[PDB]
């Protein structure tokens, strides 16, 4: 299930001037656009080759929306400070996430449009794309405001229509990267840590997309409670990395097997030391 | 392609 997702961050700054507005847009785990209100002359900027060849009208219209969104978020931050009776002397953060998931019929599987204030849920469009869930009494002020303005109908029109159509266009123009999974390249390393013990570390490198599962088994049964996992992390080139480690008694290494599940793999992998 | 711009909070 492919997705397109936008991430807006608006941060007020007392005395330094206008709030800073940063936007990033992704298709699946691939970023394709960035906007930063603090840039020299702020403009939507390509981050993936399948939008770099879009013409000047595309980038002009994207830039105009980001500029207007920054101005509206500044008003929102001011209103929120009033809702919570907070100080001008403090900096505050307004975050927005929205986008569409592509369904098997090529239309919307689900749409979302969610907000957070200072790191906590503030208000969210419900999956019906018609009604809102407010997190506290302050967000109920916004909800009544957005209900009166029929904000949800405006957002629903984008999420069900324009969002899906952009996503389908991107998936076609970036077909050779966005619709081609990159299988993880795997190997196991061995490091004695104590002197009847050794760390077996199972590595997964260079895979796309980021979703992956790494599991250690001792005698066919999962060693979940003794497995250290790191969070999946970016390699910096568009691919991701992850590893899982267990401390095993020296001489028992050949019992342990690492198991790899990923979209780029026709069948799950089994590795041993 | 980004959404348009609606009401402030």
């Amino acid at each position, epitope marked *: 299930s492919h997705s397109m997702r936008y991430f807006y961050t608006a941060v007020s700054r007392p005395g330094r001037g206008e709030p800073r507005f940063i936007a990033v847009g992704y298709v699946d785990d691939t970023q394709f656009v960035q906007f930063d209100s603090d840039a020299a002359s702020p403009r939507g900027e390509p981050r993936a080759p399948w939008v770099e060849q879009e013409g000047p*009208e*595309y980038w002009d*219209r994207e830039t*105009q*929306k980001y500029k*207007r969104q920054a101005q509206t978020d500044r008003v929102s931050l001011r209103n929120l400070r009033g809702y919570y009776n907070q100080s001008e002397a403090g900096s505050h953060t307004l975050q927005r996430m929205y986008g569409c998931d592509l369904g098997p019929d090529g239309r919307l599987l689900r749409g979302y449009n969610q907000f957070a204030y200072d790191g906590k849920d503030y208000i969210a469009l419900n999956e019906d794309l018609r009604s809102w869930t407010a997190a506290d009494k302050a967000a109920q002020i916004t909800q009544r405001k957005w209900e009166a*303005a*029929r*904000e949800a109908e*405006q957002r629903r*029109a*984008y999420l069900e*229509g*324009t969002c899906v*159509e*952009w996503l389908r*266009r991107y998936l076609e123009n970036g077909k050779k990267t966005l619709q081609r999974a990159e299988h993880p390249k795997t190997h196991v390393t061995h490091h004695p840590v104590s002197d009847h013990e050794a760390t077996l570390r199972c590595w997964a490198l260079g895979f796309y997309p980021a979703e992956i599962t790494l599991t250690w088994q001792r005698d066919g049964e999962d060693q979940t409670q003794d497995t250290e996992l790191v969070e999946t992390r970016p390699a910096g080139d568009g691919t991701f990395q992850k590893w899982a480690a267990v401390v095993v008694p020296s001489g028992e290494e050949q019992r342990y097997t690492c198991h790899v599940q990923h979209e780029g793999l026709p069948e799950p992998l089994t590795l041993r030391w | *392609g*980004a*959404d*348009g*711009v*609606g*009401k402030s909070a």
Partner: T-cell receptor, first 111, second 112 residues
Framework: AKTTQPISVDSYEGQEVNITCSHN???????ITWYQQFPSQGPRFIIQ???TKVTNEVASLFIPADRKSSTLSLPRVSLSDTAVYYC?????????????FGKGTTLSVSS | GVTQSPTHLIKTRGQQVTLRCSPK?????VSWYQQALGQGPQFIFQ???????QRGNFPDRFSGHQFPNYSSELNVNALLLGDSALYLC????????????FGSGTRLTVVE
């Protein structure tokens, strides 16, 4: 994505009338909508679409696969359909560009 | 529907005018257009939340206003004969193009 359309179309009562409109520069965040302006009136909404054929009580709207043109189809015209017909390509993005009119097509109907 | 007033108006060269429009019930955005004879409507500006949000190719002597109740004024001073036109108002909700609804216009003729 500005529109271009014929200056005029002539017709007789009871026939199907088709008005075609060219908009080669249409974008993904543009939709298609048609208005009619009778004498002594402002333009009035007829029909809108994106990529699928649309049919309502007043007209059909045909949109080919590349969306670079569109055709308004009036089923069995009468004298009361005499008006100027405007094909518009409109920004779908909220707070984007307001609707910009091109020249439009004068439809006359004879008996 | 959209209410425009007056329906017709005559002014002499150099005078000033105020045209008025109330949006359709449920609409809060107002767009003004100038339609000269034999032409399509030409976009003047659009007002939302009491502020001009975009403007077409018209000089500063064309100015606008929007009241808290969403009603709008088109103000033109130093009128010229070429300003003679049908002035159209279109209303919508929150600056969307969907549901764009026009009034019947104000026919303004500037005479020598």
């Amino acid at each position: 994505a500005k529109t271009t359309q014929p200056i005029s179309v002539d017709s007789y009562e009871g026939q199907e009338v088709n008005i075609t409109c060219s908009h080669n520069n249409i974008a993904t965040n543009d939709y298609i909508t048609w208005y009619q302006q009778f004498p002594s009136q402002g333009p009035r909404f007829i029909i809108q679409g994106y990529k699928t054929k649309v049919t309502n009580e007043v007209a059909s709207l045909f949109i080919p696969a590349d969306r670079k043109s569109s055709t308004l189809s009036l089923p069995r015209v009468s004298l009361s359909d005499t008006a100027v017909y405007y094909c518009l390509v409109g920004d779908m993005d909220q707070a984007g560009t307001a609707l910009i009119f091109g020249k439009g097509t004068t439809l006359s109907v004879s008996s | 529907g959209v209410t425009q007033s007056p329906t017709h108006l005559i002014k002499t060269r150099g005078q000033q005018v105020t045209l008025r429009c109330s949006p359709k019930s449920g609409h809060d955005t107002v767009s003004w257009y100038q339609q000269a004879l034999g032409q399509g409507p030409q976009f003047i500006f659009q007002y939302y939340e009491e502020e001009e949000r975009q403007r077409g190719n018209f000089p500063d002597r064309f100015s606008g206003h929007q009241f808290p109740n969403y009603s709008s004024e088109l103000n033109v001073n130093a009128l010229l004969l070429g300003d003679s036109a049908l002035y159209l108002c279109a209303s919508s909700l929150g600056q969307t193009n969907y549901g764009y609804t026009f009034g019947s216009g104000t026919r303004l003729t500037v005479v020598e």
